[PDB]
Amino acid sequence: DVQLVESGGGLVQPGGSRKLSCSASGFAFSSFGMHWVRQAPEKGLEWVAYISSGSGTIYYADTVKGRFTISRKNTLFLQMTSLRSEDTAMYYCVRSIYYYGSSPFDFWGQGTTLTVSGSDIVMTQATSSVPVTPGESVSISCRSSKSLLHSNGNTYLYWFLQRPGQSPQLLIYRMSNLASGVPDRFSGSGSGTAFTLTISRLEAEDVGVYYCMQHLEYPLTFGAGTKLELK
Amino acid sequence: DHFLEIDKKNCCVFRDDFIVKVLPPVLGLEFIFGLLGNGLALWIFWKSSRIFLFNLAVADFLLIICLPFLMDNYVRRWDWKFGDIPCRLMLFMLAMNRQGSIIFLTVVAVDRYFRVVHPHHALNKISNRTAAIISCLLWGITIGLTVHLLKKKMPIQNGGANLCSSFSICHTFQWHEAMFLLEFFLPLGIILFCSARIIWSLRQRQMDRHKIKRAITFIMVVAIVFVICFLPSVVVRIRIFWLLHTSGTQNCEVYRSVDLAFFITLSFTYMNSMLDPVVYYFSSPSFPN
Amino acid sequence: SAEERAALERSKAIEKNLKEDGISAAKDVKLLLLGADNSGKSTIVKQMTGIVETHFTFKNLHFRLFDVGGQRSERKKWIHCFEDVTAIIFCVDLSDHESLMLFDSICNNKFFIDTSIILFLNKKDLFGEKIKKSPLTICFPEYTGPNTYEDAAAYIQAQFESKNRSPNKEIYCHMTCATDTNNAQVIFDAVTDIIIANNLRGCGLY
Amino acid sequence: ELDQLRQEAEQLKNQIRDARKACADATLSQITNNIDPVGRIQMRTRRTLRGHLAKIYAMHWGTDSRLLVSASQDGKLIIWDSYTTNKVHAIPLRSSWVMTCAYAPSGNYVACGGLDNICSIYNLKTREGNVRVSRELAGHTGYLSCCRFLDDNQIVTSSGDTTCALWDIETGQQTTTFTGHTGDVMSLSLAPDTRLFVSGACDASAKLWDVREGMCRQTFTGHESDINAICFFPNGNAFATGSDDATCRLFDLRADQELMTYSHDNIICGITSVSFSKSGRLLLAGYDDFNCNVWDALKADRAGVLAGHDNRVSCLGVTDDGMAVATGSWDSFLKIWN
Amino acid sequence: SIAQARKLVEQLKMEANIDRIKVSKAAADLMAYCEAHAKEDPLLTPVPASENPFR
Lengths: 231, 289, 206, 338, 55
Ligand SMILES: Cc1cnc(C(=O)O)c[n+]1O
Description:
Radius of gyration of chain D: 20 Å
Structural class of chain D: mainly beta
Transmembrane segments (chain B): 27-45, 51-71, 90-110, 130-150, 180-200, 216-236, 260-280
Number of domains of chain E: 1
Cytoplasmic side (chain B): 111-129, 201-215
Number of strands of chain E: 0
Strand content of chain E: under 5%
Distance between the termini of chain E: 61 Å
Main location (chain B): membrane
Organism (chain B): Homo sapiens
Bound molecules: 5-methyl-4-oxidanyl-pyrazin-4-ium-2-carboxylic acid
Subcellular location (chain B): Cell membrane
Oligomer: heteropentamer
Largest sheet of chain E: none
């Protein structure tokens, strides 16, 4: 079925260069705007780059602009130049299609680890660890500096679940809808600034890290990451 | 019978008497017929052929507006009282209207040649947006080709009357004469070549036995009316050039007879605007309906 | 415009794609094909239960040839789909009045008052052989004339052409021997004559 | 025995006519005369969906009153976004002869059909990212002129072989076939409860079918020509048939005969699409005379003209919330009135 | 033909057993439905542009 496999990691000396390639197969890659999301070894996801359908527009993060370059035979390429010490991270290839009723960030690639030797919408999660027991109910909260409820009624607060050792999967998109393939236990709520992902009858398979995201305007800023550990 | 120095150059001007009794009855008739025909044609009026005809009617609309203002000049024994801006703008946009009318006749004939001889060529399938920018471009070059008439110094206080004339009879060879000569020489050749090719292509297909005969007659009479309207002015102007080169301005007694002949035949250029509704009304069955 | 900008990008991408496909499909020339059953409809361009679409290229034109005889229903309820066909190709089996009635019905339809009908008279040699043994009076009781192939063919052609009344349409009668491969050239030249006639109409001069 | 059967049929028809005429104590006009007039209804073109390059033959609003799908003979079935004029999808049809279209109540599936004798069901929410055919339903001997989704699984199609059939998209076989029409079944309209529907045929009759048992409960006549369109009243107890004789009648299911007729002397073209309003008071019926008259469904008089099209209107659709009506004519422009 | 005629005869007989109500009752019911939903029809009353989405 749908797979986004990739390679191009390995140890890189500082000041060098390395090409990261996203191999896409099993979907209409010509009509998908693939993103690039990196994860530090002990931090939350951070946005890197984005290339649209037909390469109409390309966006880069504040701390990435100029140094990197993203371009797209069903393959996406990311150029890395002048690597720093903070670029040691695992890079994920994320697909996203944009129309009315679409499901952005629905699929996330496997990811490859790579190591080396102010007006943005900042979003904070009040809690970082919530120890809960299976069969109970848990609630993860998320806030934002600026209200995300746009004029057309859509509020952009995507929720992601990252099981240990597995790439994150979309759970709640636009803060109210439910992603396809997700059990109906999850449910989003909130309006304007405060968001909440309510889980009812929590199972043993719902443990992991929950990330809060916005899509109101680039650059997209993930949350700090809330961990729902067992017991 | 007269002399005048303009722009540091001598130039001859003659004010005949037959003009006052011959210019404004026919010119008013052309204005009356032109306003009656072209006025209704634009009101009635999109394809590539339709848009080209629409702009052609627009050019005739301003030319029809010119005639009452020009007729006042003839009736007042060439005594202009409007001033600098009215005379300058009137001459500039009148020259622009003729040039546009001639160039749009050329464009229409070229369109017909491409649509009868080369039916499968891509140019017959141009969108209205492509036609609109082309029509504007042809409008633009007409503005540039006559912009120098706006910078001229006029009127000139010569005796008790003020001249509002740009077609002064003298050896001074301004670019306006060059434009007035080319705009007849080249478009006439284009019209004749396109018409001849259309006739030959329709005859070769062996489908002239039919409506096609009426089409042939209309295509021929367009060129016929064009040539009969524009030949007298150009031949008289060539006579003026020959006389100026051979004899010079030493004596202006012989330039009185030719000067009056120039304007009366120049009135035929307006007559082109009067016979342009034939392209609208006489052609197509939709117009009689 | 948070992500609706990306939605506009998708809309513009397919709007341009629609325009690119639209101009490409405008070069094709559509020719509705009619006629009675087993009347030679498939033996005109032989060299090159729904609707049947046949396409071939000749002299840089894409001739699309719909054979709509496979619809076992009323013509009037779907004949407006073919309102904008360049021409109608009609095949008549000379070796067999139903074709004449169908031609009368289709040549005066309200949607086909401006679309010319190219008429093909197939089986010329079979018709000649039949005339050499059986006369045209059997199929046309009003026929009074010489018993020759040429006269009978001309009479049938005149009868077919006489069923129109709109002067804005023309019938390009042509006869095939069911073996000549040059019918494509006849279709091409008839189509280009119709095209230049329509162009003259569009210029307000026809 | 054939003569006896014909005599029995004639006697039954006479009994039906007598029963129908016996119940008409008072017509609709003399009862609705006590109601005040609706007044003139003025409507302006809020949106215009440019992008089609051929005649538009169908248009069905989505259940969310925002997504409009239009089918044209250019070979495409574009799903529009009426609020912002955007195009969501552009589905390239297998064949260019399309005369109908449909949009699933859930929004997942889009139907299509025409002279191909095949009703194709497309899958909008495919995981591969593109729109792909899910089941090319086939089995009809004539052109499929109208298809509607009862739900995501079962579709009813009206064909030109005097037959309306209820398919099953999961298996692709005719679960139930309804027969009894004399001419082409050129229109169809499922009831709000989706347990029954009507089909206006070319024989000037609009039979009331039943989805479950596959039997025609009632038959309605009174038209002088073919029925080109048909739609239920919002209540579900009435429907309006748009004939080709420049008239459209409002039948009642329980009364079982025509109630009012909507005819005007200044109208001679044939109706191509009739659709009610949310409250059922208006009957926005399109015409081949380039316009779209709005009729008071009770007073039986005109209340406005939606003249904004340069060609015959081939479809008309009022959204579920009633806030918009869209007409798609052959000039390739679908305009969203309001 | 005999079987086809029999089917039509039975079909007409089946429709003859359907109960029919008075036309006045149906007209009154339609009028009541139209009046009870008059306030919910945004076509006959021009909806204000404040909340009308087609502005
Ligand atoms: C006095 C006069 C009259 N007519 C024209 C003309 O070009 O028509 C030009 N001038 O100069």
